[PDB]
């Protein structure tokens, strides 16, 4: 079962994370910005697909989007960069296991979250400058999707955030339990497919959604309050799924007590 | 290497009962995770089912099958405890004298209940998303639960047998390869076959019923409908996993 | 290359097969019964697919069926069970290499064939009992396909059997020439796709087609006499394909020239 | 990067090929016959697909055909059998690197070619015997395709042959540059997808196209001369792509100078 | 983590490239010509797909094209050949790490670029010679796509170039961080899926687009000056994405400070 070995690996990763931040904020933030941008790249692609297929009235739209999102977290895992959603399980487990403090945990969460946002912001501006969202079905897909995410009840967003980060974090969990990089990507592929097509909410992906929506002059269905509204609810949900379910879960499984 | 496989099944059976005797909390938490992991596969393919049924696609059941792999892949990759696979493992470990019938029924009971706890928690949180307040996906849960609860016992029993043959044989494959990619592929193929052919999985049905019982959508379900199905399918699962795969692997491996 | 090493492996597999049989008819038939069952599972899957897409008039039908048949031989290989079709190459090669005898070989063929049949019969009974073949497009796909295979001329069935088992056996051969379990599954997937979609005939798989069809009470248009006819033609087909083509072929490729402890190449 | 290692591998494979022939022509011809038939099996499949989908009026026909051809060269690589096409790169590089003579190379080309043809003749005979090409969309697909290939201008077949064997040989090249069988199969899959769907000409695959079309009693409009014409032009193109592009290219990269 | 190890690897690859160029321009240009031709092979394929599916009015056209482009960078990685785009990250990182100089970097960029073009030119001549772009939906797809690429505003081309090479270079980065060839190909497949389908601009792929369009007598939409316009704007964007984002970024993560 290797639950102790697994918890031992998560504890080390938590430690390595807080060490990296303490050693160099610039390294930690660049890492976070890359992850934020890598996740956003998955959004650019599946929203392009969403625009193309919704316009055709395809029934496969949300299925093809889910199948196509794999790159988001695959890039993060293969580049070894810092993403807020994964850090919910990692810091949580390492903290319960006395590897790191609550303060360390807050630091890592806040810095990776802000760094992820910087990467989303950067990608958004650049994407807008491509003219790819000047007008047409892709722009319209950004605008409609952003508006629907911004107007869902808090409770619904919260609970979707929870299920989303159980899925993200369990695929990160899998990556700590296999030595086959191909098996890692596959599990990531399956988990992102499940969470996208099922309708769960990913805070870091949402940053790029609102980034593009706000920066684009052609899109005007949502405001910054809406963006912040959705981001807060979903982030809170993400934290609950990652730390309360996956982090506590893996702690309980591996703790020699 | 049938002998070596039998030994692996036996050692796994021993670790299972050892875990339970050491910590119920750890055993049940492992079980609740597995029940949740399987349920997640159900959320995915019922979302697909809803979407494609609404559109009248003839591919509906085929896509549902192709998309169920995550269910058991997560269980295997996380090393957690699912009732279905435990039928073969404890059954073979028992015939091979690593564990007793008492241990076997303890494991089955605890993993079954733990799986259910996972299903219930998943159902609650999923209903809370608002994703099945109304529309084709909500309707797919209601209709699918109702057709499953109204099936004759015999039909459910036999579908339970074939389903767990498929689940247990993919577990067996996972014991006969060192490749995790090969493991996931075999699991993918076996789940594809059981979902699309129309076989019945007791743990997955737990999420089907917890979702339906928690959602405000008015089905024709009832708790007695769910229990009826779960009982018939569980017994079918036990026969397929213990009598076929369990006994079968003992016979191939037993250095007599 | 590495044909001699492969030939030794085939030979060893043959020796182990007969050793096992001699040691335990029960162990051997149980292994064969699983394989028949594992192959049949593939049939239950692709026939469900066939039923669904035929009923919808989809042109993709036979393509999707072929793409979805991989589970059949993949389960056999990954479970190390005994399937008649594969045994045709292995026993054949092992014999030519002085490892097993014509006697041992016909025994394995007979025992694995009957064993595969036991697996199909059980699966058919169990499957029919699910109610999934009571009525509808899948029941009909079984009935119609069972009828078309049994009403086909012997020559067509025979040659279809040759090509089927060439593919089945070459995929088994690939599994002897790689250490990667994933490459094994992929190669099996490719070969089973080719053979199902192109329309070749597989004897063990046909055992499940007729078992489900004979055990089913949704009409007939069949006859256990029709099944036997098909099973016989296809089986002889599978035999030459696996033994005359793949078996002899691998022997020739791998037989060290210095032996020559009986025959000379050129 | 390991170009010299690679050229050493090509040269050693070329030496092993001419040694096999000198040692045993029947072994060599049996190996070639297997290769010719393995390739032909790909044609039987994708022509069935071609038949089915052409009859459907589907725009995906040539795409699905391309994706389904991988079995052809995968079988050859995994069985270690002798196929003419790939032999163009291997014997030319090994020759340029002074491991084999010009005479050896032409012996290997002639024998693998005649051997491949023998494999295709056997397959086409057995295939017609199945009654699968007595009538229907598949028989027709065989009949039309054989006729369109035979009536093509020489220059067009020649250049198609070149690009086909660049793709065949580069995927044989990859097979020498990885120790992963899965990676090998994937590259063969991508390259065969590419050459089929783009419309390039493969001499050995054509042998099976013409053995079926000509051996089939259900009529057509090919003729033996038409078959020979296509085979000569495509074979010449295959040689140029494999030897002059891939062979010479890999020699230059890897040559100890 | 292992950023430092990754940076040593890039630096070492940078050193190996400049050494190869100094030792033999021929070996280096031939490697470059191959890569340009390998990338162009992906263009030939996905443009065939584009013609077929556009002609049929399929809404899957752009998605199937992206899914089918993996062969381009897969060949380059697996054959170990020199492509300009990937060189933007490798050289810039190697140079920042003091392994190679600014002069080495501009020399590698210019030679790989020109080498890639030669490969593009050679492929274009030969593809035209196949008769495959004589008339019909595929020739039309080249013509229309080349025109639209040449008539796009500079800023749009530039930013598309940035996002394209971040995707190309990150897949090259992943290839440096795994020992699994299969995982390399998967990551390449994903990144190329993302960049094609999203609409980003690849300078080396574009050389074949204009190669085919210009050499063909039946295509009359673009002109040489148009190709140069596109190639300049896109090459500049590619450089920024590979060197400024990816190169500078992996240095910062990796630099033992
Ligand atoms: C939330 C708590 C769930 C606990 C489930 C316990 C189910 C009890 O189940 C019983 O356990 C006994 C030993 O304890 C065994 O001897 C019996 O075979 C078994 O039926
Ligand atoms: C649908 C077909 C999927 C093929 C995916 C192949 C992924 C290869 O993945 C590799 O498989 C090897 C097994 O040989 C393992 O040893 C390696 O650890 C693993 O990385
Ligand atoms: Cl993530
Ligand atoms: Cl399960
Ligand atoms: Cl088989
Ligand atoms: Cl070939
Ligand atoms: Cl590139």
Task: Describe it.
- Chain B: Its main location: membrane.
- Chain B: This is Formate/nitrite transporter.
- Chain B: Belongs to the FNT transporter (TC 1.A.16) family.
- Chain B: One of its GO terms (molecular function) is formate transmembrane transporter activity.
- Five copies of one chain form a homopentamer.
- With 257 residues, chain A is mainly alpha-helical.
- The first copy, chain A, has one domain (1-257): Glycerol uptake facilitator protein, CATH 1.20.1080.
- Helices cover 81% and strands 0% of the residues of chain A.
- Chain A is built from eleven helices and no strands.
- In chain A, helix 2 (25-56) crosses helix 6 (102-129), helix 2 (25-56) packs across helix 10 and helix 8 crosses helix 11 (224-254).
- Chains in contact: A-B, A-E, B-C, C-D, D-E.
- The C-D interface holds C 1-3, 59, 62-63, 152-153, 155-156, 158-160, 162-163, 166-167, 170, 173-174, 177-180, 182-183, 186-187, 190-191, 193-194, 197-200, 249, 252-253, 257, 265-266 and D 16, 20, 23-27, 30-31, 34, 37-38, 41-42, 44-45, 48-49, 52-53, 55-56, 58, 64, 68, 70-71, 74-75, 78-80, 126-127, 129-132, 180-182, 184-185.
- Residues 39, 73, 76, 83, 85-86, 168 of chain C line the site of one chloride ion (CL).
């Amino acid at each position: 079962r290797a639950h102790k070995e697994t918890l031992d690996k998560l504890t080390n990763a938590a430690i390595n994370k807080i060490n990296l931040l303490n050693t160099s904020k610039v390294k930690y933030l660049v890492s976070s910005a890359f992850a934020g941008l890598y996740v956003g790249i998955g959004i650019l692609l599946i929203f392009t697909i969403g625009g193309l297929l919704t316009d055709a009235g395809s029934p496969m739209t949300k299925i093809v989007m889910g199948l196509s999102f794999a790159i988001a977290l695959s890039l993060v895992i293969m580049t070894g960069t810092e993403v807020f959603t994964g850090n919910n399980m990692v810091m949580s487990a390492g903290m319960l296991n006395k590897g790191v403090s609550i303060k360390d945990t807050s630091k890592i969460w806040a810095y990776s979250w802000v760094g992820n946002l910087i990467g989303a912001l950067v990608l958004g501006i650049i994407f807008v400058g491509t003219g790819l969202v000047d007008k047409g079905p892709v722009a319209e897909f950004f605008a409609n999707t952003a508006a629907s995410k911004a107007s869902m009840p808090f409770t619904a967003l919260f609970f979707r955030g929870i299920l989303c980060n159980i899925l993200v974090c369990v695929s990160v969990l899998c990556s700590f339990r296999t030595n086959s990089d191909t098996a890692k990507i596959i599990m990531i592929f399956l988990c992102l497919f499940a969470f996208i097509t099922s309708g769960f909410e990913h805070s870091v992906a949402n940053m790029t959604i609102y980034s593009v929506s706000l920066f684009s002059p052609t899109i005007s269905t949502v405001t910054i309050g809406g963006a912040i509204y959705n981001l807060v609810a979903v982030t809170l949900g993400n934290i609950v799924g990652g730390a309360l379910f996956m982090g506590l879960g893996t702690y309980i499984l591996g703790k020699e007590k």
